[PDB]
Amino acid sequence: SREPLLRVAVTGGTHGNEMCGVYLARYWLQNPGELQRPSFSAMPVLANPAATAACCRYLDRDLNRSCTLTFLGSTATPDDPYEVKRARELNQLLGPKGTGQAFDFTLDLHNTTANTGVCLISESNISFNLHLCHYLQRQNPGMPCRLFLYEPAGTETFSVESISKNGICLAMGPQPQGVLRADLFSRMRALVASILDFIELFNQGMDLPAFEMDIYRNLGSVDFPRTADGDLAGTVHPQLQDHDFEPLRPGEPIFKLFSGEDVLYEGDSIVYPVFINEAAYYEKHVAFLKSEKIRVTVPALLRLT
């Protein structure tokens, strides 16, 4: 039968300049009462302390790309990237990744400079995660809450939340890095509260009926237009800017070059752009991710068969 989630973490500041999670984590470390439910208490964690102190995404390496078994399992060294060192600590705290000692669930908080609104990023189609999203949607009529299915292309998962048995990322934008907006802070805070409510209901044995829902599944990235030297030759087109999750159709403009020309989408199908013009993605060569919108059937989670 159903195993309750008793070891639950909420991580903020995985990227040190994403301010909602930074300040929620700091606040809850001073005031943990908010994270307590009848069946469990969630542990708040500031994921990247040094980056947070410096208010930057990362010091040496992206922490949210440093949690592969290869990194975690490798022999230490004084000259290791700071974030590799910190990944190993999180592995001790919340893992070890891939063993029975790992936490039951980690909720990881993110901001984006893209106009995403509320987005749950899941690295698998695990039905619990889809039920969680569905619950948030129903708790918030008229507020988009979208599930972005981002399955790792490589061999190894790499994210902070992947350390635990299961987990999910709550991402909210748009918000400039290093800026804390009251509106996003409060909303993220209430959504976390609701996610903890959900886990509590689950722990109490609530039946979650099977249902269908639309999700967005990652197809790949499109890079900024570049010169031969890889310097920007333009940026996201005004008609694409801020239109995350909206249909992008072949023939439609996606970039405006500095020379004044328009670049058109040359794909065969309508896709759904996500994370359009994210500051942190310039160096990753990503102007946006392409996703396909798909209707999936989510099995029931019942206490008994």
Question: Under the rule (CB under 5 A), what is the footprint of Zn ion?
Answer: 15, 18, 110
What does 169 bind: ligand 3NF, Cl ion, Zn ion, none (CB cut-off 5 to 8 Å by kind)? Answer: ligand 3NF
Answer whether 290's CB lies under 8 Å from 273's CB.
yes
Measured from the CB atom, the residue of 53 and 206 that comes closer to Zn ion is 53
| Residue 290 binds ligand 3NF (CB under 6 A) | no
- Report, in angstroms and rounded to the nearest whole number, the Rg of the chain calculated over CA atoms: 20
Neighbours of 263 (CB within 10 A): 15
Q: How many whole angstroms separate alpha carbon 284 and alpha carbon 286?
A: 6
Minimum distance, C-beta of residue 134 to Cl ion, in the bound complex (Å) = 4
Minimum distance, C-beta of residue 253 to ligand 3NF, in the bound complex (Å) = 24
Answer whether 83's CB lies under 8 Å from 131's CB.
no
The secondary structure element, H or E, covering residue 171 is strand 167-173
Stated length of the chain: 305
Minimum distance, C-beta of residue 217 to its own copies, in the bound complex (Å) = 26
64-83 positions binding ligand 3NF, by CB under 6 A: 64
Minimum distance, C-beta of residue 52 to its own copies, in the bound complex (Å) = 12
Contact mark string toward ligand 3NF, 119..158, x via CB under 6 A: --x-x--------------------------x--------
Contact residues for 85 (Cβ-Cβ < 8 A; gap 6+): 76
What residues line the site for its own copies (CB under 8 A)? Answer: 23, 26-27, 55-56, 113, 174-183, 185-186, 231-232, 234-238, 241, 256, 258, 277-280, 282
Cis amide bond preceding 209, omega within 30? no
The secondary structure element, H or E, covering residue 46 is strand 42-46
- Where on the chain is the footprint of ligand 3NF (CB under 6 A)? 15, 64, 110, 112, 121, 123, 150, 159, 169, 171, 278, 280
